[PDB]
Scaffold this motif. Structure first.
Motif, PDB file in Angstrom:
ATOM      1  N   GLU A   4      69.288  -5.788  44.256  1.00 12.76           N
ATOM      2  CA  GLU A   4      68.366  -4.866  43.606  1.00 12.76           C
ATOM      3  C   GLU A   4      67.716  -3.928  44.618  1.00 12.76           C
ATOM      4  O   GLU A   4      68.240  -3.716  45.756  1.00 12.76           O
ATOM      5  CB  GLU A   4      67.290  -5.638  42.838  1.00 12.76           C
ATOM      6  N   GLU A   5      66.551  -3.373  44.263  1.00 11.73           N
ATOM      7  CA  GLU A   5      65.728  -2.537  45.137  1.00 11.73           C
ATOM      8  C   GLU A   5      65.248  -3.382  46.313  1.00 11.73           C
ATOM      9  O   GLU A   5      66.010  -4.163  46.889  1.00 11.73           O
ATOM     10  CB  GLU A   5      64.514  -1.985  44.372  1.00 11.73           C
ATOM     11  N   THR A  12      56.834   0.407  47.408  1.00  5.06           N
ATOM     12  CA  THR A  12      56.589  -0.507  48.522  1.00  5.06           C
ATOM     13  C   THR A  12      56.227   0.355  49.708  1.00  5.06           C
ATOM     14  O   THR A  12      55.115   0.264  50.247  1.00  5.06           O
ATOM     15  CB  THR A  12      57.843  -1.329  48.916  1.00  5.06           C
ATOM     16  N   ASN A  13      57.183   1.192  50.109  1.00  5.35           N
ATOM     17  CA  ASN A  13      56.995   2.094  51.239  1.00  5.35           C
ATOM     18  C   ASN A  13      55.955   3.166  50.889  1.00  5.35           C
ATOM     19  O   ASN A  13      55.819   4.171  51.605  1.00  5.35           O
ATOM     20  CB  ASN A  13      58.348   2.684  51.711  1.00  5.35           C
TER      21      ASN A  13
END
Lengths: 85, 61
Positions: A4-5, A12-13
């Protein structure tokens, strides 16, 4: 793990807000970058005049002293006491 | 059983390898003094995220 991601980069970033449009900080200096006074330079005028005043911080109000002169238009009032001149 | 080995006295030394062990041994425990000083840097510190670690330099505004 994913595959996945990575619970998603642009979330997140999400400290792409250590750059972003964060003139939420930065450009709070470069509007005071030109700051005054009079404004600007001259007339009214580089102290003092000052000691004292626009800006410093602080503090503190501020006023003061009518705004002027009530009194001191010679003396005040007025047209201009009277009072007696 | 036997006895000798190695030849010397803990194959002593050598007298540059005594220095080989040196502060390559000790300076590493200079640097786990970095450890000493937490060895967490996560000081319940949030914080050393979003990873990190450091990194103030120190920006402001």
């Amino acid at each position: 793990g994913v595959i996945e991601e990575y619970l998603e980069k642009s979330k997140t970033n999400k400290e792409l807000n250590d750059k972003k449009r964060l003139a939420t900080t930065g450009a709070n200096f470069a509007r005071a970058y030109t700051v005054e006074f009079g404004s600007c330079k001259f007339p009214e005028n580089f102290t003092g005049c000052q000691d004292l005043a626009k800006q410093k911080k602080v503090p503190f109000l501020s006023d003061d002293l009518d705004l002027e002169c009530e009194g001191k238009d010679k003396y005040k009032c007025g047209s201009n006491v009277f009072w007696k001149w | 059983l036997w006895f000798d080995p190695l030849g010397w006295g803990s194959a002593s030394p050598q007298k540059l390898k005594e220095l080989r062990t040196k502060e390559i041994k000790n300076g590493r425990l200079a640097m786990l003094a970095v450890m000493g000083a937490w060895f967490q840097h996560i000081y319940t510190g949030t914080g050393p995220i979003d990873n990190l670690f450091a990194h103030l330099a120190d920006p402001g505004h």
